[PDB]
Design a protein around this nucleic acid. Structure first.
Lengths: 47, 63, 61, 60
DNA sequence: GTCGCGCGCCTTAAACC
DNA sequence: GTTTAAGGCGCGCG
């Protein structure tokens, strides 16, 4: 995946397409390689 | 990860290099209903851990 | 079906230019999306309907 | 609305076991899940129902 | 502001017992 | 006459 990598580099709302971004986020959480601790905003990091 | 993913991951691994099976087959050989089997397979898929050849029915092997 | 031709005439009605989403196709016709997609996907079986994938998928002839 | 109250009526009235799936509520009432689920997840945030988990979720 | 959503899924017909 | 179907479906989304 091209656009997944990009997000990883950084390390939660980011200024490139933000709809397409959340898909790729929850993917890598479900998918792994990211943590999702709840609350608003949803917080994100590498595990 | 999960017990069920464990079992499924066992069976597919043991079939061979590039050997693929169906939710139906799995369902029978593991004694779990197809619905559960599919639930997990599609998960493992979204998890990068497996590969779906699409068709009727889809074929499942390791990526 | 009553809805099938209606779904058709709406796609058909708005040129060959482009497809639309089931969502709006619903909202304009006042019919729920469930009924809409049922039919779209039903029709795409047959050759007339033509599905262009995505999220959300786009529907043209 | 009309639907909230009926659904709202259904749970306690038919409190056999505890709770039922959006699906069942639909089939009884002859109404698609969209309207039903809207109303259930609505009635949750504010307090009058509990989502006991599963697939589909169960509401009491 | 949480939103990831793609969803059609049987008011089921084709298909394997 | 059960089981399949992409059938996995959880969906509520404004």
């Amino acid at each position: 995946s091209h656009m997944e990598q990009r997000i990883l580099k950084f390390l939660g709302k980011l200024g490139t397409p933000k709809k397409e971004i959340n898909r790729v986020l929850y993917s890598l959480a479900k998918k792994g390689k990211l943590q999702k601790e709840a609350g608003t905003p949803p917080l994100w990091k590498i595990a | 990860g999960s017990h069920m993913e464990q079992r499924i991951l066992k069976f597919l691994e043991e079939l061979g290099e590039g050997k693929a099976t169906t939710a139906h087959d799995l369902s029978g050989k593991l004694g779990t209903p197809k619905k559960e089997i599919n639930r997990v397979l599609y998960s493992l898929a979204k998890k990068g851990k497996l590969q779906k050849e699409a068709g009727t029915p889809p074929l499942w092997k390791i990526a």
